[PDB]
Design an enzyme around this catalytic site. Structure first.
Site, PDB file in Angstrom:
ATOM      1  N   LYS A 162       0.833  -1.157   0.000  1.00 50.44           N
ATOM      2  CA  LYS A 162       0.000   0.000   0.000  1.00 50.44           C
ATOM      3  C   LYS A 162       0.875   1.215   0.000  1.00 50.44           C
ATOM      4  CE  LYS A 162      -2.424  -3.023   1.337  1.00 50.44           C
ATOM      5  NZ  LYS A 162      -3.507  -3.969   1.568  1.00 50.44           N
ATOM      6  N   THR A 178     -22.754   7.262  13.070  1.00 58.31           N
ATOM      7  CA  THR A 178     -22.015   7.189  14.292  1.00 58.31           C
ATOM      8  C   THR A 178     -21.962   8.596  14.954  1.00 58.31           C
ATOM      9  OG1 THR A 178     -19.739   7.636  13.495  1.00 58.31           O
ATOM     10  CG2 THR A 178     -20.495   5.347  13.228  1.00 58.31           C
TER      11      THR A 178
END
Ligand SMILES: Nc1ccn([C@H]2C[C@H](O)[C@@H](COP(=O)(O)OP(=O)(O)OP(=O)(O)O)O2)c(=O)n1
Ligand code: NA
Ligand code: NA
Ligand SMILES: [Zn+2]
Ligand SMILES: [Zn+2]
Ligand SMILES: [Zn+2]
Length: 327
Positions: free
Chosen positions: A64, A93
Site C-alpha cells: 500500500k 455514528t
DNA sequence: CATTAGA
DNA sequence: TCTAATG
C-alpha cells in the site's frame, strides 16, 4: 511528525475502516501499530521495502505504502471514500448514542440518513433519541463566554444544596481554552470517601437541583457516581435561545479528588509527562491516587493528598498552573 | 479502562 | 449475563 505524515494518515483511514465498516479488529489493529511505528520512524520513508523493515509492517502494508508513494493516492482508499455504505456508517455514528454496531445495523435496514433516522425514532432508544434531537447543538463548540455562565450556575446550586460539596469544572475550560466541547464537572463531598460505603443521594441531590431550576434538560444516563446529561443556558429576554449542551457530573470519594482532578484537567501531554516524572521521583500516579515505588520491582501505599499542589510536591515538581498544563 | 443501558 | 457506548 510530518516526515511520515501521509503514510500515517492513509494508514489511519485504512485502520478505521476495517474496524467500523467491517469488523476486522485484527487488521484494524494491524494498521495502527504500523501507523504507530512509522510515525516515530524518524527518517523519510522512500519505499515499502524500507518501511517493511519496520516492526508491524508486513507485506500488505508495504504494498500500500508503495502505491501511495508512487501515485499520490491509494485505490482501496479511493473506493471506500466513495462507497455509500461505508460513508453511511461513518455518518450515523455522529449521533450521540450511535456506535458502529448500531450504525452497521441501521444501514442494513436502510437507515442511511438522519431523515430516515427521524422516520424511525421507534428503532432508537432514548440516548439515541435525545442524540438525534440535538444532533446540531451536539456538534457545536462551547464558547468559554458560555462556559463561565454555565459554571457559575452550577456552582451556586451545589452550594445551596450543601455547602460541604466540592465542585470543579475540569477539562480544557480549566486549562484556559477558548472553547470546549462539553462541560465536566468534578464532584466530591466530604462524607464520601474511599471506605464509607457510597452515598448515591450525594449525587442525586444535585442532579435534581440543577434539573429543578431548568439547567438540566435531559438525562442520557444516571448512575450513583456518574450522571450524563443535557443542560442549557436560559434563553434570556428572548431571541437568542442557547444550544443544548453535553454535561457530565461525577461523584468522587473525597480522598481521591485532586488525583481525579489533576487527571481530568489533562492535558494528556501534561499527564503522561506528569506521569513519566512521578516514576523517576520514586512513585506512581493514576486517575485516583499516588503510591510510592518500592524497589522489589513495585510497591503500593496510597499517599495522602489535600490538593493538586501536594502531588507536585510529592514528585517534587513545579506547580504548573492549569493554564499551562498544555504539555 | 470504567460505568450505565439494554435486551 | 453480554455487549455496546461515552468517556
Ligand atoms: C482525558 C482528558 C480529560 O482529562 C478527560 C476527558 O475530557 P474530554 O474528553 O471532554 O476532553 P477535553 O476536556 O480535553 O476536551 P473538550 O474541549 O471537549 O472539553 O480525560
Ligand atoms: Na455517535
Ligand atoms: Na466473545
Ligand atoms: Zn534518514
Ligand atoms: Zn470535555
Ligand atoms: Zn465530557
Amino acid at each position: 511528525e510530518t516526515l511520515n505524515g501521509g503514510i500515517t494518515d492513509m494508514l489511519t483511514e485504512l485502520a478505521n475502516f476495517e474496524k467500523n465498516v467491517s469488523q476486522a479488529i485484527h487488521k484494524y489493529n494491524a494498521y495502527r501499530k504500523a501507523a504507530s511505528v512509522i510515525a516515530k520512524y524518524p527518517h523519510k520513508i522512500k519505499s515499502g521495502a524500507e518501511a517493511k523493515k519496520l516492526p508491524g509492517v508486513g507485506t500488505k502494508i508495504a504494498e500500500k505504502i508503495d502505491e501511495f508513494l508512487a501515485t499520490g493516492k491509494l485505490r482501496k482508499l479511493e473506493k471506500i471514500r466513495q462507497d455509500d455504505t461505508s460513508s453511511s456508517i461513518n455518518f450515523l455514528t455522529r449521533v450521540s448514542g450511535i456506535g458502529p454496531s448500531a450504525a452497521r445495523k441501521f444501514v442494513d435496514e436502510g437507515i442511511k440518513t438522519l431523515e430516515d433516522l427521524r422516520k424511525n425514532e421507534d428503532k432508537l432508544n432514548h440516548h439515541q433519541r435525545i442524540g438525534l434531537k440535538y444532533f446540531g447543538d451536539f456538534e457545536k463548540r462551547i464558547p468559554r463566554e458560555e462556559m463561565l455562565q454555565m459554571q457559575d450556575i452550577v456552582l451556586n446550586e451545589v452550594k445551596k444544596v450543601d455547602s460541604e460539596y466540592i465542585a470543579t469544572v475540569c477539562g480544557s475550560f480549566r486549562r484556559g481554552a477558548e472553547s470546549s466541547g462539553d462541560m465536566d464537572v468534578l464532584l466530591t463531598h466530604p462524607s464520601f470517601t474511599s471506605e464509607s460505603t457510597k452515598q448515591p443521594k450525594l449525587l442525586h441531590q444535585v442532579v435534581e437541583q440543577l434539573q429543578k431550576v431548568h439547567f438540566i434538560t435531559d438525562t442520557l444516563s444516571k448512575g450513583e457516581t456518574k450522571f450524563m446529561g443535557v443542560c442549557q443556558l436560559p434563553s434570556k429576554n428572548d431571541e437568542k435561545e442557547y444550544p443544548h449542551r453535553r454535561i457530565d457530573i461525577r461523584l468522587i470519594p473525597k480522598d481521591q479528588y485532586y488525583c481525579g482532578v489533576l487527571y481530568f484537567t489533562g492535558s494528556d501531554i501534561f499527564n503522561k509527562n506528569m506521569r513519566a516524572h512521578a516514576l523517576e521521583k520514586g512513585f506512581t500516579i493514576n486517575e485516583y491516587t499516588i503510591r510510592p515505588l518500592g524497589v522489589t520491582g513495585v510497591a503500593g501505599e496510597p499517599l495522602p493528598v489535600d490538593s493538586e499542589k501536594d502531588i507536585f510536591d510529592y514528585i517534587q515538581w513545579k506547580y504548573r498552573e492549569p493554564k499551562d498544563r498544555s504539555e
